């Protein structure tokens, strides 16, 4: 398509509207109510341009550029005097009721309304009458509410309801008394409510966790990092000030998590600021503790490990690929063990084998939204991999998109698309032990035990292909629902099968693989998605190693006397009594970690590892994509006594001091080259980011904005003499303003979005090739494995039906977005969001045991009895008991396990 803007000719996409086409070209049109992910509605009237009928037209007509298609031969003017006057008038109308709040408003310096007020050139007030005011609501621990600052742009309700599927936010009232919020005071129930603070162009919805320790955007130090709180791999921008992690902003990745995080990633960062974190290496002598510097810790640990007969290693899916590899190098591959349990490891390697040997393409998170039928087997996606649930919601709305495209409706005119596709949607079939948050859009929800979910999957596979193994003993009603699922999946042009390791069953993953293979054999464009548990679960599975039980047997038989434990709370993957026994028996326990874990009282040496904010590394998401995270700040800048190093730096220095009796720390690229040389299956992590010698025209990439303030006063209470700038020999980023953050810079790693005149999150428009697309020179991260040419065979081990047993309660997992990821539970703001741990019972089982709702019942596991209060769960089938995985005292390894002597307390 050809458009003519202010006399200049441009080539654009004819399926785009004029606002997105002009913003993709670098032109500046002010806008409020349009968002790239939400489409156009034409509410705020800010984006007015003057459209002419042809080239020889002089009058024109004011139109909304967001509501006008960028068709071939369009003639518009942005800098027309009437259009500029109207845009300034719209800003002025928004400013009549706006409170005098910018100094005490958390959006200041990051405010889209401030930027557009300046952009329209409106700075003189002639309105002299009263300003309307509003009372505020309490919205829960994460989002602060200030309705005085609202410009009624409807972005919040459109995102929250139409995009995110939330139900407790809305618009109320009338003409100029329109109020955006909840019907009453209460916590926002959506798992994606935290994106409101970036969606809202004003300071109505603000990050309350940031507001407790507020600082302005120009004062932050940013880095491009990866969210550690689950396996999805959403790109984030952690921003710090005065040594503490202050905020987590969304970092745009056009392939992964484009505009949106989940609330666990956005608000579950507070463990980094915990005061009980290890700051320096501590060694226990008798019952006392002494603090060493890094050189003495290396010398002493190397001497003691050299004296030992066999050192074994216990990695973690928390830790990066470099640190796990450095542990495997320090102790040896045969003496290296993965820190996860045997069944967890078997499910993880089966998921990996399906992903990289199943012959079926695994889509990225953005690509999930294009599939026209979704079958979720076992995985409670909203509580474990929430952004996948958001993408599946978009894929479900794909049917309304298709029916609107049949009627020649433009893809950005979102209200018309929603009107045409009233309640029609692509088929979603979710299976779980109970009800899920996807049930409001699911075509069918199967509440059954994990073996019954696997039997449903195998029956679906056999009904799609007769070569797949059959399931005997299917009820006619279940058979009819299976036929409904099979007819939906067979007629789909792009079916997606989602599963994961959180369901705690191998047969669920095998059933998902068999359904994917049956759909592949019919010539369909089937995709398969696996959901892992932690941030680098797939990296630990690719690296491999023995299970935690093998390391426990090594430490219990006594043939291993030294154990290194990296970034691992061992009680999550094994019983606490066995771990405590094996660590009390071991004459040397060394723990490299960044959080005060429960195995640090039996640890002879504790090394203060860095968290993700203070470290660099590579993590593998469940898609198979290697992603590099970068250090945000130097922990020794404000407190010079802090000895907090990268985990791979600690372990490499330990290996060097063991071999050559000399302390060499390392560089990061040397560890990357070591990983890709010893491990060919991790050879893709070299290309995840450029090395530390990468430059943009000779200069490094800046971590802090240009107007970073207080550089001669922020440490002046300690000493008036300014310290040296911290040196980053690890990466291509500099710990200073003296660097490059241009939107046109040839790079893929962007620490923060800022452009002149665009101080809000809308500067990501400037950092993109087209708005809502990808980053200009490609999204960061590369895929480790491609689709295999040949798939697997059908798994013939169909499990039997679940039979309840008397005195034997099968544990059904109940994951929570706030509580099932260990580090996020450590965050103090998650305690207010923390649900009370309730054990779920069937009405029949609770009636048999004579316990009502809210009564305390005690159950015995691993020879220990614990008491939990009863919540009645109707959907949970009999013979099962529901437990919240990952909580304080309930390990995720308990999922799929049995339980004995459940008695009323």
């Amino acid at each position: 398509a050809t458009i003519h803007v202010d006399g200049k000719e441009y080539e654009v996409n004819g399926a785009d509207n004029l606002l997105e086409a002009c913003l993709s070209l670098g032109l500046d049109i002010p806008y409020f109510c349009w968002h790239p992910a939400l489409g156009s509605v034409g509410a705020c009237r800010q984006c007015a341009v003057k459209q002419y009928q042809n080239a020889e037209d002089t009058r024109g007509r004011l139109v909304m550029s967001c509501m006008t298609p960028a068709s071939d031969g369009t003639f518009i003017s942005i800098d027309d005097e009437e259009a500029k006057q109207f845009r300034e008038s719209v800003v002025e109308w928004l400013m009549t009721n706006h409170p005098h709040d910018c100094p005490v408003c958390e959006e200041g310096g990051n405010c889209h309304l401030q930027d557009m007020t300046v952009m329209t050139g409106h700075s003189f007030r002639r309105y002299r009458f009263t300003k309307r005011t509003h009372r505020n609501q309490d919205l829960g621990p994460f989002i602060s509410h200030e309705m005085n600052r609202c410009i009624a742009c409807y972005r919040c309700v459109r995102y929250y309801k139409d995009y995110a599927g939330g139900t407790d936010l809305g618009v109320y009232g009338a003409h100029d008394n329109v109020y955006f919020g909840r019907p009453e005071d209460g916590t926002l129930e959506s798992e994606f409510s935290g994106n409101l603070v970036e969606i809202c162009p004003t300071g109505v919805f603000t990050d309350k966790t940031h507001s407790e320790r507020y600082n302005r955007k120009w004062d932050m130090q940013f880095a491009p990092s990866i969210c550690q709180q689950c396996s999805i791999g959403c790109n984030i921008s952690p921003g710090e000030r005065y040594g503490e992690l202050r905020r987590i902003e969304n970092r745009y990745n056009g392939t992964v998590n484009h505009y949106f995080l989940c609330d666990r990633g956005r608000f579950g960062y507070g463990y980094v600021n915990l005061k009980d974190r290890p700051r320096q290496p501590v060694q226990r002598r008798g019952d006392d503790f002494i603090t060493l510097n890094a050189e003495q810790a290396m010398q002493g640990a190397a001497d003691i490990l050299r004296q030992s007969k066999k050192v074994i290693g216990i990695g973690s899916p928390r830790a990066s690929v470099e640190s796990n590899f450095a542990l495997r190098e320090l102790v040896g591959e045969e003496n290296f063990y993965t820190g996860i349990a045997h069944g967890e490891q078997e499910r993880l390697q089966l998921a990996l084998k399906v992903l990289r040997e199943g012959g079926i393409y695994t889509p990225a998170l953005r690509e999930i939204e294009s599939y026209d039928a979704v079958l979720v087997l076992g995985e409670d996606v909203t509580q474990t991999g929430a952004r996948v649930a958001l993408a599946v919601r978009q894929a479900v709305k794909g049917k309304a998109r298709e029916m609107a495209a049949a009627q020649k409706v433009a893809d950005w005119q979102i209200a018309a698309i929603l009107n045409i596709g009233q309640r029609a949607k692509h088929p979603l079939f979710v299976t779980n032990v109970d009800d899920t948050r996807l049930d409001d859009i699911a075509a069918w929800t199967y509440r059954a035990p994990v073996e019954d979910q696997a039997r449903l999957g195998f029956a679906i596979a056999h009904a799609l292909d007769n070569s797949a193994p059959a399931v005997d003993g299917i009820e006619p009603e279940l058979q009819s629902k299976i036929d409904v699922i099979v007819q939906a999946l067979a007629g789909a042009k792009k079916p997606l099968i989602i599963s994961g390791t959180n369901a705690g069953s191998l047969e669920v993953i095998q059933a998902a693989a068999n359904v994917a293979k049956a759909l592949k054999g019919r010539g369909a464009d089937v995709g398969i998605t696996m959901i892992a548990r932690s941030v680098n679960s797939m990296g630990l599975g690719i690296m491999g190693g023995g299970s935690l039980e093998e390391a426990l047997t090594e430490l219990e038989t006594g043939r291993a006397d030294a154990v290194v434990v990296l970034e691992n709370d061992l009680h999550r993957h094994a019983s606490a009594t066995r771990v405590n026994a094996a660590l009390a028996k071991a004459p040397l326990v060394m723990v490299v970690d960044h959080q005060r874990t429960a195995i640090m009282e039996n640890a002879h040496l504790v090394l203060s590892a860095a968290s993700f904010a203070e470290s660099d590394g590579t993590v593998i998401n469940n898609e198979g994509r290697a992603q590099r995270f970068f250090q945000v700040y130097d922990p020794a800048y404000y407190d010079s006594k802090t000895v907090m190093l990268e985990s791979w730096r600690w372990l490499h220095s330990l290996h060097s001091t063991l071999l050559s009796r000399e302390v060499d720390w390392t560089q990061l690229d040397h560890v990357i080259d070591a990983v890709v040389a010893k491990i060919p299956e991790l050879a893709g992590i070299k290309d995840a980011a450029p090395d530390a010698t990468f430059r943009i025209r000779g200069q490094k990439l800046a971590r802090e904005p240009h107007r970073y303030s207080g550089r001669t006063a922020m440490r002046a209470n300690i000493s008036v003499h300014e310290p040296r700038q911290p040196q980053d020999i690890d990466t291509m980023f500099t710990f200073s303003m003296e660097g490059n953050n241009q939107p046109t810079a040839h790079r893929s790693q962007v620490p923060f979005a800022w452009a002149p005149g665009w101080n809000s999150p809308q500067a990501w428009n400037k950092f993109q090739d087209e708005v809502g697309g990808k980053l200009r020179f490609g999204d960061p991260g590369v895929r480790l494995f491609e689709t295999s040419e040949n798939g697997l065979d059908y798994f013939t081990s169909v499990p039997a039906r679940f039979q309840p047993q008397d005195g034997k309660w099968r544990i059904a997992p109940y994951y929570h977005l706030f509580g099932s990821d260990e580090l996020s539970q450590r965050a103090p703001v998650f305690q207010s969001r923390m649900p009370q741990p309730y054990i779920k019972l069937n009405p029949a089982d609770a009636a048999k045991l004579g316990v009502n709702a809210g009564t305390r019942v005690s159950f015995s596991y691993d020879g220990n009895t614990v008491t939990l209060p009863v919540e009645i769960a109707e959907g949970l089938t009999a013979g099962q008991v529901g437990l919240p995985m990952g909580m304080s005292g309930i390990a995720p390894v308990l999922a799929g396990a049995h339980l004995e002597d459940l008695k009323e307390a």
Partner: protein, 146 residues
């Protein structure tokens, strides 16, 4: 409905039509046709952007036509007396009759059915009786508050 003019198989022609009455809740914006459609769907009566028009995707995404009471009341006379009768009511560009009237401080405020092309002074003086005694005509609005 009792006489067979509404419901199933109207006049033995196989045409099914059901007519409902939906009473409003007091907002002026609901009279706008797309906002009327939104209000009929049980939503806040915000109007919709056109295109698409309600004829293609209106009420619940279905083809929908919204018409005034007086237009629908003009339809049966057209279909009972013929097109050429309706075209010959007045010699004006707007065919047919129209309910016109005058309100305010006039002697006879009311409503009369007149052909298009009747002047405002004819409605004010002949039909409305002019202004009241001791009142001088300053201004007038032809067709409502807008």
């Amino acid at each position: 409905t009792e006489a067979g003019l509404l419901g199933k198989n109207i006049m033995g022609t196989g045409f099914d039509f059901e007519l409902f009455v939906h009473t409003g809740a007091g907002r002026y914006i609901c009279g706008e046709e797309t906002a009327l459609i939104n209000s009929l769907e049980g939503r806040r009566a915000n109007p919709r952007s056109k295109p698409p028009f309600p004829a293609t995707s209106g009420a619940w995404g279905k083809p929908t036509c919204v018409n005034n009471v007086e237009t629908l009341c003009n339809v049966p006379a057209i279909l009972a007396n013929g097109v050429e009768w309706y075209q010959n009511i007045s010699k004006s560009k707007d065919a047919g009759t129209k309910l016109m009237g005058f309100s305010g401080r006039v002697k006879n405020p009311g409503l009369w059915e007149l052909p298009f092309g009747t002047t405002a002074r004819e409605i004010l003086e002949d039909y409305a009786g002019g202004m009241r005694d001791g009142l001088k005509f300053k201004a007038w609005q032809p067709g409502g508050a807008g």
